[PDB]
Design a protein around this ligand. Structure first.
Ligand SMILES: CC(=O)N[C@H]1[C@H](O[C@H]2[C@@H](O)[C@@H](CO)O[C@@H](O[C@H]3[C@H](O)[C@@H](O)[C@H](O)O[C@@H]3CO)[C@@H]2O)O[C@H](CO)[C@@H](O)[C@@H]1O[C@@H]1O[C@H](CO)[C@H](O)[C@H](O)[C@H]1O
Length: 162
């Protein structure tokens, strides 16, 4: 149906596709930096994860972050900073039954992904207005590719699983 799966890869990805990651493992599943004003990664957290300080190696830095997930399903949590020496801070999250999240970089270089919760009723695509034109995107997960004209198909997978 879908093009894929492909093994984990880093590349300066094009803008006319959604990248549907299907991470086998928790932890860092996605990252991108422009090396100057924006660093972003997504951490997949298991259900019933009490608040924990964890050390992670991401985009060539060893950093410490807080993670938590008191829910009964998976939680993909976005972390960002806007300068080299800042600490990472949490942004949006996706609550989901499935090991699936999806990313797209728009033509202005902004990262979009899925936020919210299908079960709660506020699942949405949200865009972080922090351009990273030509930045290498690290997909730390097996993934599939979906043409940008087919966002509804991507949403279907995010909601329902593969
Ligand atoms: C107020 C509300 O709707 N709370 C929801 C909660 O919704 C948040 C999530 O969608 C997260 C995902 O990242 O985004 C939050 O909105 C962000 C927005 O995306 C940012 O751009 C903006 O800068 O900040 C806002 C605020 O941080 C949403 O607010 O999602 C949870 C989990 O599904 C819901 O349970 C929660 O609903 C509330 O649940 C409460 C008890 O658990 C109460 O029932 C309350 O009445 C519900 O509204």
């Amino acid at each position: 149906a879908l093009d894929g799966p492909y093994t984990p890869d880093s590349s300066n990805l094009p803008s006319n596709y959604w990248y549907l990651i299907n991470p086998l493992n928790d932890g860092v599943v996605f990252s991108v930096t422009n090396n100057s004003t924006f660093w972003m990664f997504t951490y997949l957290i298991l259900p019933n994860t009490a608040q924990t300080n964890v050390t992670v190696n991401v985009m060539n830095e060893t950093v410490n972050i807080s993670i938590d997930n008191s829910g009964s399903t998976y939680r993909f949590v976005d972390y960002f900073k806007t300068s080299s020496t800042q600490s990472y801070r949490q942004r949006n999250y996706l609550i989901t039954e499935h090991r699936l999240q999806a990313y797209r970089r728009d033509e202005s270089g902004n990262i979009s992904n899925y936020w919210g919760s299908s079960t709660y009723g506020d699942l949405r695509v949200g865009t972080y207005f922090n351009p990273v034109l030509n930045a290498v995107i690290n997909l730390n997960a097996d993934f599939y590719i979906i043409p940008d004209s087919q966002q509804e198909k991507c949403t279907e997978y995010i909601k329902g699983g593969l």
